[PDB]
Amino acid sequence: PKVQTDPPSVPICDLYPNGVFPKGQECEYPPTQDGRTAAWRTTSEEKKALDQASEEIWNDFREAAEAHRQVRKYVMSWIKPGMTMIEICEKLEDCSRKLIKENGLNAGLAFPTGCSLNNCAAHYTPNAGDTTVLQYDDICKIDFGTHISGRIIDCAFTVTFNPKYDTLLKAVKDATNTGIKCAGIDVRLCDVGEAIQEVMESYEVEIDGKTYQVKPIRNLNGHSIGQYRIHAGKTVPIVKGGEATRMEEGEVYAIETFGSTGKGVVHDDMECSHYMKNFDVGHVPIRLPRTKHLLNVINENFGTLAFCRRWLDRLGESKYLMALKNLCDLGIVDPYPPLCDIKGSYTAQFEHTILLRPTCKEVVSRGDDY
């Protein structure tokens, strides 16, 4: 049989010659408010047939999830202080490309590698020239995505080296798990947020002689996922007070949670690295040549998936920042700058992708690690 190498290099598709990829964790849905269980979905005939009818879709998520598991286990084996952020992202991405068997828009990287540090929670990846080095005391959120046929896995974990952050990571992990347990068909999104927050705030942590109650970052959220659409328009709060809109059968969610020792609110900060075409904007004729060319490059290589400046650089593009600004100003592309709490704060993140299948809830990105 074909077996994965160390370091990993064999495409997931070659490890499963039959074309059937491993299921993630399958869960009976939670009891409804009545006390009534969801054990009926497990066998039911109409649900089973409706589930089977989307089997090729779930299978594509599963392939992408297996790639995510293998990549992240590899990353955790070598990520160390002293490495530059650029070296970390490049090493990660090279492996992800190999294991997903990158093939244009058919299979690839769904969005840039997040490696946000310390008070910064999300949407940091280095641009060219960034000399930032990972430190012993750093708290680094590794957030990367894979996709097959635009079926996206968004899954993330927090890397530390100093044990002082262990309880902060435990809090956020537990909160994410709680959100995943709460989730289900017909579950109100606001209830998921309230449940996440109750858990997260049940924790207190001590870091360098100061104590904190872990705060959810109120303006960060989980999100539904659509084909080639990382944020499909439904938001999963991580605090109380959200919308009572319900989760639906067949939806896919990224259940993310973020905890902070700061304000518990992020703002835009630092140079932008992440961008993505606006999904709702259609064809716009462009005559300006550098801007036309860049848009063509984005359409060919990314479509509606997110990208970063380093990914443009790697395609041979240079001196494109004004064209990229033009596309932003035109509303064709949106910038997604780093999102950071106050200076001196610490932030942590865990995230999984879940499939609300007719027969069960599948935590498709679950591993033995988290």
Measured CA to CA, the distance from residue 78 to residue 83 in angstroms comes to 10
Amino acid identity, position 23: K
From the candidates 66, 174, 191, 223, give the one annotated as an active-site residue: 223
Tokens of 180: 């995943």
Does the annotation count 248 as an active-site position? Answer: no
Q: Contact at 8 Å (CB) between 18 and 326?
A: no
Q: Which of residues 338-357 bind Co ion (CB under 5 A)?
A: 351
8 Å CB contact between 308 and 221: no
SS3 category, 280: coil
For the chain, the first-to-last Cα distance in angstroms comes to 28
The answer to whether residue 256 is catalytic is yes
By CB under 5 A, residue 154 contacts Co ion = yes
**The pairing of beta strand 222-224 with beta strand 235-236:** antiparallel
Per annotation, catalytic residue among 194, 256, 317, 341: 256
Give Rg (Cα) of the chain. 20
Interacting residues of 334 by C-beta distance below 8 A, sequence separation 6+: 275, 276, 277, 278, 328
For 13, the enclosing helix (H) or strand (E) is helix 12-15
Q: Is 339 in the site for ligand 94A (CB under 6 A)?
A: yes
Residue with tokens 């054990």: 39
Amino acid at 146: T
236 binds ligand 94A (CB under 6 A): no
With contacts defined by CB under 6 A, name the span among 3-11, 125-133, 220-228, 359-367 that binds ligand 94A. 220-228
- How many whole angstroms separate alpha carbon 65 and alpha carbon 350? 15
13 or 140, CB closer to ligand 94A? 140
The tokens describing 178, both together, are: 């709680």
267 labeled binding residue: no
Q: Which does 311 bind (CB under 5 to 8 A by kind): Co ion, ligand 94A, none?
A: none
309 binds, among ligand 94A, Co ion, none (CB under 5 to 8 A by kind): none
Q: Which of 185, 276, 312, 333 binds ligand 94A (CB under 6 A)?
A: 276
Token pair, residue 369, equals 């690690």
143 included as an active-site residue: yes
Indicate which single residue of 205, 220, 295, 363 sits in contact with ligand 94A (rule: CB under 6 A). Answer: 220
Output the smallest distance, CB 302 to Co ion, in A.
Answer: 17
Please identify, using beta-carbon distances, which residue of 41 and 223 lies nearer to Co ion: 223
For position 157 contacting ligand 94A by CB under 6 A, the verdict is no
Pick out residues in 50-89 that bind ligand 94A (CB under 6 A).
none
| Chain positions contacting Co ion, by CB under 5 A | 143, 154, 156, 254, 256, 351
| Chain positions contacting ligand 94A, by CB under 6 A | 111, 122, 143, 154, 219-221, 223, 230-231, 256, 274, 276, 306, 336, 339, 351
Which residues are known catalytic residues? 143, 154, 223, 231, 256, 351
